[PDB]
Design an enzyme around this catalytic site. Sequence first.
Site, short mmCIF file in Angstrom:
data_model
loop_
_atom_site.label_atom_id
_atom_site.label_comp_id
_atom_site.label_asym_id
_atom_site.label_seq_id
_atom_site.Cartn_x
_atom_site.Cartn_y
_atom_site.Cartn_z
N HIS A 38 -7.21 5.77 0.53
CA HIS A 38 -8.15 5.47 1.59
C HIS A 38 -7.42 5.45 2.93
O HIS A 38 -6.19 5.47 3.00
CB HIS A 38 -8.84 4.12 1.36
CG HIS A 38 -7.88 2.98 1.19
ND1 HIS A 38 -7.17 2.77 0.03
CD2 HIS A 38 -7.52 1.98 2.03
CE1 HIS A 38 -6.41 1.70 0.17
NE2 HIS A 38 -6.61 1.20 1.37
N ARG A 84 -0.57 -12.23 4.83
CA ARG A 84 0.33 -11.10 4.59
C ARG A 84 1.69 -11.46 5.17
O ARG A 84 1.80 -12.35 6.01
CB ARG A 84 -0.24 -9.83 5.23
CG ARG A 84 0.59 -8.57 5.05
CD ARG A 84 0.05 -7.44 5.90
NE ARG A 84 -1.25 -6.95 5.42
CZ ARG A 84 -1.43 -5.80 4.76
NH1 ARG A 84 -0.41 -5.00 4.49
NH2 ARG A 84 -2.65 -5.46 4.37
N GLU A 95 -10.89 -0.77 -2.17
CA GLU A 95 -11.81 -1.57 -2.96
C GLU A 95 -12.85 -0.67 -3.62
O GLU A 95 -13.34 0.28 -3.01
CB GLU A 95 -12.49 -2.61 -2.08
CG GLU A 95 -11.51 -3.54 -1.38
CD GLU A 95 -12.16 -4.43 -0.34
OE1 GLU A 95 -13.25 -4.07 0.16
OE2 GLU A 95 -11.58 -5.48 -0.01
N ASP A 119 -6.77 -0.88 16.27
CA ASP A 119 -5.85 -0.89 15.14
C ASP A 119 -4.52 -0.27 15.55
O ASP A 119 -4.47 0.72 16.28
CB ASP A 119 -6.44 -0.11 13.96
CG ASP A 119 -7.53 -0.88 13.23
OD1 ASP A 119 -7.53 -2.13 13.32
OD2 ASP A 119 -8.37 -0.24 12.57
N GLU A 132 -6.59 -12.69 -3.89
CA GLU A 132 -5.93 -12.69 -2.59
C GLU A 132 -6.72 -13.57 -1.64
O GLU A 132 -7.89 -13.87 -1.87
CB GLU A 132 -5.83 -11.28 -2.00
CG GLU A 132 -5.40 -10.20 -2.97
CD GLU A 132 -5.55 -8.81 -2.38
OE1 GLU A 132 -5.08 -7.84 -3.01
OE2 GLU A 132 -6.14 -8.68 -1.29
N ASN A 133 -6.07 -13.99 -0.56
CA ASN A 133 -6.79 -14.59 0.55
C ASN A 133 -7.41 -13.48 1.39
O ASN A 133 -6.81 -12.42 1.59
CB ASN A 133 -5.87 -15.46 1.41
CG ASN A 133 -4.65 -14.71 1.90
OD1 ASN A 133 -3.91 -14.12 1.11
ND2 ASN A 133 -4.45 -14.71 3.21
N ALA A 134 -8.63 -13.72 1.87
CA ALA A 134 -9.33 -12.72 2.66
C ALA A 134 -8.85 -12.70 4.11
O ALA A 134 -8.81 -11.63 4.73
CB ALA A 134 -10.84 -12.97 2.61
N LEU A 135 -8.49 -13.85 4.66
CA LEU A 135 -8.10 -13.97 6.06
C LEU A 135 -6.74 -14.66 6.16
O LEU A 135 -6.37 -15.46 5.30
CB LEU A 135 -9.15 -14.76 6.86
CG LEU A 135 -10.59 -14.28 6.70
CD1 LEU A 135 -11.56 -15.37 7.13
CD2 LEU A 135 -10.83 -13.01 7.50
N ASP A 195 0.84 -1.19 0.00
CA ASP A 195 0.00 0.00 0.00
C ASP A 195 0.88 1.24 0.00
O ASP A 195 1.84 1.33 0.77
CB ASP A 195 -0.92 0.01 1.23
CG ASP A 195 -2.13 -0.89 1.06
OD1 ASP A 195 -3.03 -0.56 0.26
OD2 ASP A 195 -2.19 -1.94 1.74
N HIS A 198 -19.49 -12.06 0.49
CA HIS A 198 -20.05 -13.40 0.34
C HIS A 198 -21.28 -13.64 1.21
O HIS A 198 -21.97 -14.64 0.99
CB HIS A 198 -18.98 -14.45 0.65
CG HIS A 198 -18.32 -14.26 1.98
ND1 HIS A 198 -18.84 -14.77 3.15
CD2 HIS A 198 -17.19 -13.61 2.32
CE1 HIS A 198 -18.05 -14.44 4.16
NE2 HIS A 198 -17.04 -13.74 3.68
N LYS A 221 -9.44 -3.47 -7.32
CA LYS A 221 -9.72 -4.45 -6.29
C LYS A 221 -11.21 -4.50 -6.03
O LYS A 221 -11.84 -3.46 -5.79
CB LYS A 221 -8.96 -4.09 -5.00
CG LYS A 221 -9.08 -5.10 -3.87
CD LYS A 221 -8.25 -4.63 -2.67
CE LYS A 221 -8.50 -5.46 -1.43
NZ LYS A 221 -8.00 -6.85 -1.57
#
Length: 488
Positions: free
Chosen positions: A89, A416, A182, A97, A376-379, A49, A296, A291
């Site tokens: 963003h 990641r 996204e 966070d 990509e993998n989401a998790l 990023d 889902h 992206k």
Amino acid sequence: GNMLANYVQVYVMLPLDVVSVDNKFEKGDEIRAQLKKLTEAGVDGVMIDVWWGLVEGKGPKAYDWSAYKQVFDLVHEAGLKLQAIMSFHQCGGNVGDVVNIPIPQWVRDVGATDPDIFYTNRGGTRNIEYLTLGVDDQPLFHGRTAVQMYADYMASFRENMKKFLDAGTIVDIEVGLGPAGEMRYPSYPQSQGWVFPGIGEFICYDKYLEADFKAAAAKAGHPEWELPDDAGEYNDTPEKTQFFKDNGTYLTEKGKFFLSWYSNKLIKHGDKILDEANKVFLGCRVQLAIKISGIHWWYRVPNHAAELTAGYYNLDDRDGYRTIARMLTRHHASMNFTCAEMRDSEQSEEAKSAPEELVQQVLSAGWREGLHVACENALGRYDATAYNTILRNARPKGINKNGPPEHKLFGFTYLRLSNELLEGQNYATFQTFVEKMHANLGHDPSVDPVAPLERSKPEMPIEMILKAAQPKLEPFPFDKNTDLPVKD
């Protein structure tokens, strides 16, 4: 024949904190050592990023690329390819966070007198993660429009990162088009109380978008139409709302018109920003990308409420993702998706979730339009099963031992990079996964060379984009399991 085309590139997303919240690079030794482990694992490249809130955070056109130039040097030094995200963003922002990078303060200061620069829900709450597309062409920011700020930012990126573009290190520019980078509305914000699997909310109530809808409704002969007021709130379920219930308003002429307007505004938001990005990077050996969020939940009900509120007008008989793919064709842009590691049986029943079907629909839509599709993998996952799911989606029909695979991802990016990925069984399992993605052919530094970027083809009438929504086609066939599994 030969089976070289089974090769699927693997990228690794760099850590969230790679550049500090004060736009300094302080992890040279750690990153170098981490990239060394990635090269040892045969990885093709990394992704990062590039935070607007850091680079242009001090003031308008006060671009400070110094930290990112240092990271990019290490990637170049490592012989790895690089995918750069133009991140317009906010990073973080939720309580707990660690890495918090809001969009520049001088941009948000405009909101003190014009709070409608922010995506706004019906209750009036302002979301500061990203500027509403309604001000794409409003010159509210010291004379500049939002699109100008984005184009100027990318132009300064090209000028300052010339060394890495000329050398071919940078192979992809991912254009952030909304929250989390996204292309979507911020329909399920944790910061405003959303909890999975809430249907979310339509976020089109800022005065700029509301005026836009009013004008469109009037031109359509229905000035009495107003923005929805019967869609519920973030954490509702579809049947508790008049908009999404059976025979709800989403099926009425009124609802169909709003949903079309809502999703079309998003598509044209990406279309125009990609057009300007294409002009900035013309001639560079990069591919542009967007992206798409993986919404889902509520996919297994006719209303697809969560997709609808995010801006994806996707129904059982309306392909809301092939329209997006159709828009991308003229820019030769790739479609980056997520949920590559998810199985339907891993989700809860009450969420009406179908990540596998969603992934298959999105990938199929991109492939039908001749696009490069990456995922990509989401998790965060380290287990063999997650990698075997990714491998399935990477080559739906497995290895073609005598030719190219019927379909395949152009690339996969792992979320990641971290120290726990590079130690013990996690690292060994990851390395085996890269080997299978490469079809046991070994790392190929020269795979998929990127042609100089050519100018976007002529803009399409919206009718040509909408033509792709129907008839909705079945997805290409996906095997249940990969033919090249990773051992647990």
